[PDB]
Structure formats: C-alpha cells, structure tokens
Design a protein around this ligand. Structure first.
Ligand SMILES: CCOC[C@@H](Oc1cc(C[C@@H]2CS(=O)(=O)C[C@H](NCc3cccc(C(C)(C)C)c3)[C@H]2O)cc(F)c1N)C(F)(F)F
Length: 377
C-alpha cells in the first residue's frame, strides 16, 4: 500500500522537503518539514509574517494542554511555545490517526522561511534529543506504539520546484535501483553513523578517520548542505579548488555566500570532482561508499540578474558540530531509516542525478580495517 505515499513530498531548493499533515478535530491542514535531524513535532500556533496559516488550538475539540513550556535552538533558527497533545494524520501516508505531542509555536527567531510553504517541523529522530527532555515522546514513536505501522521509514528526496517520497512503515522497491547498502546507527539519538574513508576524484584525503566523525556524523534531511568538520572542510575545499583550478572563483563562493553563474547549458561539470563517502558496513572489516556528483553539491539558485544564466551556490560548508549529511547528500539516493534493525540503508534513487559521463553510486563491498577506531569518543 506504499504507492499512496509515493510523491507525497514537495519543497523548494534550499528550503527543505515537507509533507502534508492534519492536526486537531476537525482536522486542520498544515505542511510540515521532514527533519531527521531533530525529534520535536512543532507547528506555528500564532500569527507570523511568513505564515499563511497556523494551528488554532481553540478550534480543536481533541486538543489537550500539557501546561508546560518548550523551546528548541537549532544551529540556525529557534522557536519557543507550549506543549500539548492532539490527533494527527498524514493524508498521503498510512491510514491511521494518532495522538501525538505537539509544540505550539508562539514565538520564533529565524525558524520560519519566507515562501517555504511549510508551517511546522516533524522531527523524526529519537527521544534522546527531544526538548524539553527525552520524556517527550517523538511523533514516530507514538505512531509505532499506537498503530501496527512497522518501525521504519524511507526518504526519497529528489532534486530539480522539488518533490520526493516519505514511505512510512516500509520500503517501496519501485523507488530505487540496484542493491541497498546498510550502515549501523551508532547510537539512537541523532541518526548517527560512522564515516570510515573519504575520497575526492578517487584520491584518499588521508586523514585520521576520527576527523570525519568529530564530534559526530549524522543524516539530517532538515539541513540543506553537506557540512564537514573544520579540518575536513579545509582539506576538501583545497582538493576541490585544485581540481577546478582551470577556472577561478571568489572566496565568497567557497564560503557559500556568493553564487557563481555560467551561460545556460555551459556549466563545466567535469572540472568539479566526485566525492566518495565510505560508511561502516554490516559485517566485520566491511564498508561501502556513496558517491556524490557536483550536480548535488552545487545547488541551483534563482538568477540574480534578469538574464537566463545557470547560477549555483557551493553547498558544502564548515561545521563545528560534526559532519552533517544533509539534503544534497540524500538527494538522488533512497535512504532507509530502519529503526527496527538500528541501521540506515542507501541505494541509488529512481530520481538519481544525471551527468553525461559520470553517475552517483552506492558501491560495495569494500574492506576497511579498524573501522571502530573511526568513531569519536
Ligand atoms: C536557512 C537554512 O535552513 C534551511 C532549512 O530550514 C530549517 C531547518 C531546521 C532543522 C535543523 C537544521 S540545522 O542546520 O540547524 C541542523 C538540525 N539538526 C542537528 C541539530 C543541531 C543543533 C541542535 C539540534 C536539536 C534540535 C537536537 C536541539 C539539532 C536540523 O534539525 C530548523 C530551522 F529553523 C530551519 N529554518 C530547510 F528548509 F529545512 F532546509
């Protein structure tokens, strides 16, 4: 019955992927950002310049106030509001209704995005990182406890304005090609994984693999960019600069500030390298790699002039909180969040990204010794 959930995601580039949901009785429809990088379900519940609608608790007969406050500080953006519960459904999801915790957002700061077309956020990670604390049961845990829905979901996020699928409760085999490759979830708080090797155009970065996971590596659909720890970011940018040194770009470009443009259809894709991230596998001394194309980490943005150029921003940026495999890594891959078996699967997506002479890939098996030493303690 997964076909009903195919193409249930929409979004704008750089502004996330959202799914339609209803809260309350009678049901109020809202678009909700799908975020595997957090664990709170929260919706606008008061007027805001960027909101065209919001949750009106007084209009819902099933709303229950929990008489407790809450706030969540993200890397960028934060909101505060009031905790309560209400009935929640996903129209293009499983045919069930659950009573879930809901943070009613009363104040926010750089949380809502102008024109994003979503009014709330669905944190799909584990209770350990829920606010105020891990006693606030996350939505997916409620879903699994109250229904027969299997304890897993999969995300197919597609690039070019964008669409995708969140398959709740399973894997839809029409959404990917080739084999699924699984990496262990290291610990159930974020979807934390372990990167064991990095190559750029087939050249090993040659860092202590702990640097790749300092202080963690997570899979985060709520984040746009691939974000890399400072030392790894620097090495990666140096390598990518060298490979593309045929052309020169302003430093603002490499900092993700300035966009670069070329005449429509003349984008020099080949001067930008492929990036391979090797992830810890399921058996001893075994790993696999996912390979990212420049079409993924050069994010398409709207033309700043009145011309018909192709313009892009560099969608790899520096992090001080570990590696973040955001939407530009997930795009073109089918990613299975197999909570039941504490593992995350990757396969080439049916909406895989195109290049004339190169292709995004998930490949294995590889042998990698001492993968345990790659985890940061
Ligand atoms: C403008 C760029 O955003 C586009 C971005 O919009 C947002 C997305 C998020 C979710 C965040 C994005 S992040 O970059 O802050 C990383 C984080 N996950 C790791 C993390 C870091 C710090 C703290 C926590 C908690 C929640 C566990 C405490 C979790 C995610 O959840 C919060 C926001 F406000 C905005 N607007 C989107 F549109 F979704 F692409």
């Amino acid at each position: 019955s997964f076909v009903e959930m195919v193409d249930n995601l929409r979004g704008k580039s750089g502004q996330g992927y959202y799914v339609e949901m209803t809260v309350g009785s009678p049901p109020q429809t809202l678009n909700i950002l799908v975020d595997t990088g957090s664990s709170n379900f929260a919706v606008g519940a008061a007027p805001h310049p960027f909101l065209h609608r919001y949750y009106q608790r007084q209009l819902s007969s099933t709303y229950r106030d929990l008489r407790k406050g809450v706030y969540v500080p993200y890397t960028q953006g934060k909101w505060e509001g009031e905790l309560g519960t209400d009935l929640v459904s996903i129209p293009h999801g499983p045919n069930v209704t659950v009573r879930a915790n809901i943070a009613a957002i009363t104040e926010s700061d750089k949380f809502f995005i102008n024109g994003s077309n979503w009014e709330g956020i669905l944190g799909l990670a584990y209770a350990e990182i829920a606010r105020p604390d891990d006693s606030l049961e996350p939505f997916f845990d409620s879903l699994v406890k109250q229904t027969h829905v299997p304890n897993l979901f999969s995300l197919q996020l597609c690039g070019a304005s964008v669409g995708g699928s969140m398959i709740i409760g399973g894997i839809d085999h029409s959404l990917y090609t080739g084999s699924l490759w699984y990496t262990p979830i290291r610990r159930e708080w974020y979807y934390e994984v372990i990167i064991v090797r990095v190559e750029i155009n087939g050249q090993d970065l040659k860092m202590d693999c702990k640097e790749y996971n300092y202080d963690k590596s997570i899979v985060d659909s709520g984040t746009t960019n691939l974000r890399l720890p400072k030392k790894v970011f620097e090495a990666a940018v140096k390598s990518i600069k060298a490979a593309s040194s045929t052309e020169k770009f302003p430093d603002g470009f490499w900092l993700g500030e300035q966009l670069v443009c070329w005449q429509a259809g003349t984008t020099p894709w080949n001067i930008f390298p492929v990036i391979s991230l090797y992830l810890m596998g399921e058996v001893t001394n075994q790993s696999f790699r996912i390979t990212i194309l420049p079409q993924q980490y050069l994010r398409p943005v709207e033309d700043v002039a009145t011309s018909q150029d192709d313009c892009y921003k560099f969608a790899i940026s520096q992090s001080s909180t570990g590696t973040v495999m955001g939407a530009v890594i997930m795009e073109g891959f089918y990613v299975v969040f197999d909570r039941a078996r504490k593992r995350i699967g990757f396969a080439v997506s049916a909406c895989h990204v195109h290049d004339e002479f190169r292709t995004a890939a998930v490949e294995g098996p590889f042998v990698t010794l001492d993968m345990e030493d790659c985890g940061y303690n």
